[PDB]
Amino acid sequence: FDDIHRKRMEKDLNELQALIEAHFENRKKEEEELVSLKDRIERRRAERAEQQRIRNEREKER
């Protein structure tokens, strides 16, 4: 019986460390990859938006 309790702590603490790591790392990987990716998407969209604004001004003159 008390071995059940020990097994529970063994899995919970192995899980705790796996979790502290997975909780943090899954977010740091997904989250930093996401902002890095979307920081670039945001910049590329802003660049394209500026280019289209310029393109629209050029057509207006045409």
């Binding site: 502290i20 943090f24 977010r27 979307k38 998407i41 945001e42 969209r45 938006a49």
Partner: protein
């Protein structure tokens, strides 16, 4: 053709405007959304990370 062009040009502008309006509302969506996306999961993550440790008593 002039009317179709005016309508198409008007629509080219409205559709492109809708495209840049949505690209912007989407960016302004997604960007503000990623903030939620990056912080709601990181806050809740880290809360859960912390919970494994919070509960180590």
């Amino acid at each position: 053709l002039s009317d179709k062009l005016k309508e198409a040009e008007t629509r080219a502008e409205f559709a492109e405007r809708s495209v840049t309006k949505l690209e912007k509302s989407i960016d302004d969506l997604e960007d503000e959304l990623y903030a939620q996306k990056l912080k709601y999961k990181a806050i809740s993550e880290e809360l859960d990370h912390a919970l494994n440790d919070m509960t180590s008593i």
